[PDB]
Design an enzyme around this catalytic site. Structure first.
Site, short mmCIF file in Angstrom:
data_model
loop_
_atom_site.label_atom_id
_atom_site.label_comp_id
_atom_site.label_asym_id
_atom_site.label_seq_id
_atom_site.Cartn_x
_atom_site.Cartn_y
_atom_site.Cartn_z
N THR A 12 20.64 15.10 -55.23
CA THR A 12 20.59 14.09 -54.17
C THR A 12 21.98 13.57 -53.82
OG1 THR A 12 19.77 11.86 -53.60
CG2 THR A 12 19.98 12.30 -55.89
N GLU A 55 14.29 12.14 -56.95
CA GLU A 55 14.03 11.82 -58.35
C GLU A 55 12.55 11.69 -58.70
OE1 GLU A 55 17.98 9.50 -57.52
OE2 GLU A 55 16.39 10.47 -56.34
N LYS A 60 21.54 6.50 -43.92
CA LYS A 60 20.69 7.66 -43.71
C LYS A 60 20.51 7.93 -42.22
CE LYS A 60 16.95 9.97 -46.19
NZ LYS A 60 15.94 9.80 -47.26
N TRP A 89 22.00 11.89 -45.77
CA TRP A 89 22.78 10.79 -46.33
C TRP A 89 24.26 10.79 -45.94
CZ3 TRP A 89 20.39 6.69 -47.90
CH2 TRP A 89 19.13 6.78 -48.53
C1 LIG Z 1 2.12 17.35 -51.39
C2 LIG Z 1 2.46 16.91 -49.97
C3 LIG Z 1 2.46 15.38 -49.85
C4 LIG Z 1 3.49 14.91 -48.83
C5 LIG Z 1 3.02 13.68 -48.07
C6 LIG Z 1 3.93 12.47 -48.30
C7 LIG Z 1 5.32 12.70 -47.73
C8 LIG Z 1 6.19 11.46 -47.88
C9 LIG Z 1 7.27 11.71 -48.92
C10 LIG Z 1 8.64 11.47 -48.31
C11 LIG Z 1 9.66 11.24 -49.41
C12 LIG Z 1 11.07 11.24 -48.84
C13 LIG Z 1 11.99 12.06 -49.73
C14 LIG Z 1 13.38 11.47 -49.73
O1 LIG Z 1 13.84 10.95 -48.72
O2 LIG Z 1 14.10 11.54 -50.86
P1 LIG Z 1 15.65 11.23 -50.87
O3 LIG Z 1 16.39 12.14 -49.81
O4 LIG Z 1 16.22 11.42 -52.26
O5 LIG Z 1 15.81 9.72 -50.42
C15 LIG Z 1 15.02 8.69 -51.00
C16 LIG Z 1 15.34 7.40 -50.28
O6 LIG Z 1 14.93 7.45 -48.91
C17 LIG Z 1 14.31 6.18 -48.53
N1 LIG Z 1 12.92 6.39 -48.10
C18 LIG Z 1 12.20 7.49 -48.35
N2 LIG Z 1 10.97 7.31 -47.79
C19 LIG Z 1 10.96 6.08 -47.19
C20 LIG Z 1 12.21 5.51 -47.39
N3 LIG Z 1 12.48 4.29 -46.90
C21 LIG Z 1 11.54 3.62 -46.22
N4 LIG Z 1 10.32 4.15 -46.00
C22 LIG Z 1 10.01 5.36 -46.46
N5 LIG Z 1 8.78 5.88 -46.24
C23 LIG Z 1 14.35 5.27 -49.76
O7 LIG Z 1 15.49 4.43 -49.62
C24 LIG Z 1 14.56 6.25 -50.93
O8 LIG Z 1 15.34 5.67 -51.97
MG LIG Z 2 17.48 10.02 -53.94
#
Ligand SMILES: [C][C][C][C][C][C][C][C][C][C][C][C][C]C(=O)O=P([O])([O])O[C][C]1O[C](N2[C]=NC3=C2N=[C]N=C3[N])[C]([O])[C]1[O]
Ligand SMILES: [Mg+2]
Ligand SMILES: [C][C][C][C][C][C][C][C][C][C][C][C][C]C(=O)O=P([O])([O])O[C][C]1O[C](N2[C]=NC3=C2N=[C]N=C3[N])[C]([O])[C]1[O]
Ligand SMILES: [Mg+2]
Lengths: 489, 510
Positions: free
Chosen positions: A177, A321, A432, A437
């Protein structure tokens, strides 16, 4: 003390496809490739070729516990890899091709991937990072043909091999991530986790996946394994329609109507573009009944927008996670008597904690905050498909859990007496944009805040190594947000 | 080496109720007691009282692994016991009160039950077997009051105790089957087995259980834990309506309409009586959408009668040894274009193997028979909620398993290319009447006893004066319901299936 007489049988992801080939062998897997061509295959064929991929990968030196990486969008070859790699006891590392070349090279080296499978249109990216990779021994293009120094997928396929059986708690896949500060953090899933996750999220109050369903995952197969959708769709024997990289409204509508899609799931950005197009053309999707939205907070307008066209919108929430699903939205039976305004507000909330998940909204000491829908606290999770730490990162691990063993999501939320959770804020300082990200601190160390956007969901605003979509659009930070809350409309 | 980063959290049945209390705490649990009265409670109250039952049972000496037995029908106290016993790490032994006193005494002594919970209307039976019991220390009546020498359930409740987490593979409950030769055999379920079973069977292509559903288990809580329905209904947070011992059509209809029942499950005999009632009176159920039938092969006419009334009928198959669900019937998407006749025939079949179940129809060597819906073979199973043997019986264990580790059901079936299984015959020599087992061989010894089709019950014994033979059987410890309906005389019985084909329509059975 008292043992059960129950068989000690392990949960395995390969069982989903083995069952699909036996009971629903003729059900289709439809893929739209990067060129726009439509490919048709079946569960029986996918099962046959996935067995061939296992024998093929073994010829390339892949053993139990080894990492096999993918860099590609949604298609049948990726689905074959989704089962072949875990099937032979290896680890499926779905990498995100939309990340920076430096980010991708870091995670491939950190996971120590032995084989890389990638889409033909992503060759330039692979050519660029190849010199930086230290462990990849075989580069495989997911296509019939491959250039010099590369192996073709169809050429890589070997003799049919039987699946390798492992204890259910063993690794089946992994994902990193970028929704953190500093370096990407790795999460390793188990067969046990993804099987249990697929079951619990498929119940009626969840996705309600059925054999009669026609499932189109708009969510990329490199986003927490497309939210486990391809696994769960295989489990029920549903027809799968895999759209590829083309997620423009015209391309989707074509697959929606042409293949009779009944269920779909994706990020808000894609759904907003689709709704815009359907409204402008006055077009109505002839089969789509259920739509799932996740990754980011679905706006109230987006839900009402689709309900107006006879499409049920259900919100879901989770993290890399957490496999990812831990929360799914549905309206309780007794709350159906509510007014349309109140019901829309309920639909706009994050939703209810799903089975086999222990959720709480708690303070700094780990004490649950009042269930009045007003008190703020951190969402904290516990369960068999929730991570207990990170791979190869001691510092990230020791701060991932509370003293009583709950995972810290970094999300600020409220919850009510009805049990509904509602994500309000984020402890972690990130942005985001369109489901991807952007690190604020990493931008600042080169003040940056997340500003609401109608289309993406957040956009960076810098107050005075990165891609064009990461560049801030315009020029003690808990106040700068409230000041420019409406800077981008 | 390279492990997963996933938490090592166990699967536990108690989480179903804990989730129910926290999210659906106000959802009702309605019970009809033996007196006819209707009791109302909620998941939050049940959860609170189950915690008190854990504390109470601990004060009575119940530790982890200890067996707590029940002899009762479907009501809130049984539902409370369904969670409290496994929640404290103990083993819930659901015992069948329809069995002979000797059988009940045997299974309670074999399981070494420490505490026995029983319905008030079953006091005479408990009094009759009490002297034969060797391990039961405390006798608890599931009511507000109890006679001398007996403890009241409300008195038994103690302090609110926190649940104890045990390894998921460890025992949560056990049940004995009389569907074998000789004495009953015990099957021990794990927390892991029943949690997985509840999830898989609750999917759309199964029972499609939901929070909005109103669930009425007509299947007794002593029949493979009411087919695991009370656990699955708690999991989804559905309203539960528990009918108690009164299963007559008039009593059920009152609950169907009065409580707005949407889903129900039971044996064919019960549903035939209901169909007879609805057709005779002209009464139509206002809320019932889904009906599940199992235990015996559902007749084609029975399915057609309910579908005509708007009620969807789905067949299910299983054994005490399998938790029990392994097969559930539903019409495949591409088979929806079949005619009414073809669809009804497909619905009359047993169904499809459900997720996490490895099913095969195999020959005596263990090889899968052709999938033409004609070739006969034995149904053999493998999975997390399928038994790998019997409790305290090495012989029964090894004879119920194949060399490659599959469980032998003793059921003869056919299967097709679409994956549909159809139970056709039985290897084991028994008679299932109204959902209960009758041993032909036990009736033979005390000359030939065969299962013959019956409209109402499912099968009924037939022996190849009729009054003499009855009294001899009654003296040997057989109940009135176990006595063969008719006696036909011959000259020579072909020693070593023909009789069954010769007297197929002797009771006018279908
Ligand atoms: C087996 C088939 C079942 C499917 C249906 C349900 C779909 C829903 C799930 C979605 C989850 C998302 C994934 C992600 O995004 O991861 P990452 O790239 O590592 O990041 C975490 C973060 O972001 C945010 N978010 C999420 N989701 C939401 C949010 N905010 C507000 N609202 C909502 N819905 C947070 O800050 C976390 O820490
Ligand atoms: Mg994450
Ligand atoms: C949780 C959810 C719920 C769901 C439900 C579903 C339904 C299913 C169930 C049913 C099962 C039953 C069980 C029993 O019965 O056990 P026992 O007593 O041990 O027995 C066994 C026997 O029986 C018979 N079967 C059953 N089922 C059936 C039959 N047959 C025919 N058909 C059907 N379906 C056999 O024989 C066995 O072995
Ligand atoms: Mg049995």
């Amino acid at each position: 003390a008292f043992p059960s007489t129950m068989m000690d049988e392990e949960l395995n992801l390969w069982d989903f496809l083995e069952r699909a080939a036996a009971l629903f062998g003729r059900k289709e897997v439809v893929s739209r490739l990067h060129t726009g061509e439509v490919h048709r295959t079946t569960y029986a064929e996918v099962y046959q070729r996935a067995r061939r991929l296992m024998g093929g990968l073994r010829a390339l030196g892949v053993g139990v516990g080894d990492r096999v990486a993918t860099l590609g969008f949604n298609h049948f070859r990726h689905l074959e890899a989704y089962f072949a790699v875990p099937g032979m006891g290896a680890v499926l590392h779905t990498a995100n091709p939309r990340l920076s070349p430096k980010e991708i090279a870091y995670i491939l080296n950190h996971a120590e991937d032995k084989v890389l499978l990638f889409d033909p249109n992503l060759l330039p990216l692979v050519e660029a990072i190849r010199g930086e990779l230290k462990t990849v021994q075989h580069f495989v293009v997911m296509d019939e043909k491959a250039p010099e120094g590369y192996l073709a997928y169809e050429e890589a396929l070997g003799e049919e091999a039987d699946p390798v059986r492992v204890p259910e708690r063993a690794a089946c896949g992994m994902a990193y991530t970028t929704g953190t500060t500093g370096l990407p953090k790795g999460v390793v899933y188990s067969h046990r986790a993804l099987v249990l996750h697929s079951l619990a999220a498929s119940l009626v109050d969840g996705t309600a996946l059925s054999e009669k369903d026609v499932v189109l995952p708009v969510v990329p197969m490199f986003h927490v394994n497309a939210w486990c959708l391809p696994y769960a769709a295989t489990l029920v024997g549903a027809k799968q329609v895999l759209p590829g990289p083309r997620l423009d409204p015209a391309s989707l509508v074509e697959l929606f109507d042409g293949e009779g899609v009944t269920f779909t799931a994706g990020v808000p950005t894609v759904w907003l573009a689709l709704a815009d197009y359907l409204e402008s053309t006055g077009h109505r999707l002839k089969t789509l009944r259920r739509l799932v939205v996740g990754g980011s907070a679905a706006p109230r307008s987006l839900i009402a927008r689709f309900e107006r066209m006879g499409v049920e919108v259900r919100q879901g929430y989770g993290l890399t996670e957490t496999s990812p699903v831990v929360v799914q939205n549905f309206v309780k039976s007794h709350l159906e008597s509510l007014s349309e305004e109140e019901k829309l507000t309920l639909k706009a909330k994050t939703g209810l904690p799903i089975p086999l998940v222990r959720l709480r909204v708690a303070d700094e000491e780990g004490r649950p905050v009042p269930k009045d829908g007003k008190a703020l606290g951190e969402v904290q999770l516990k369960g068999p498909w929730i991570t207990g730490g990170y791979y190869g990162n001691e510092e990230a691990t020791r701060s991932a859990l509370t003293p009583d063993g709950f995972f810290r999501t970094g999300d600020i939320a409220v919850w009510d007496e009805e049990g509904y959770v509602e994500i309000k804020d984020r402890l972690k300082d990130l942005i985001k944009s369109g489901g991807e990200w952007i690190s604020s601190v990493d931008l600042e160390n080169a003040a940056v805040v997340a500003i609401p956007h109608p289309k993406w969901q957040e956009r960076p605003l810098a107050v005075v190594g990165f891609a064009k979509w990461q560049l801030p659009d315009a020029y003690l930070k808990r106040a700068l947000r409230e000041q420019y809350k409406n800077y981008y409309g």
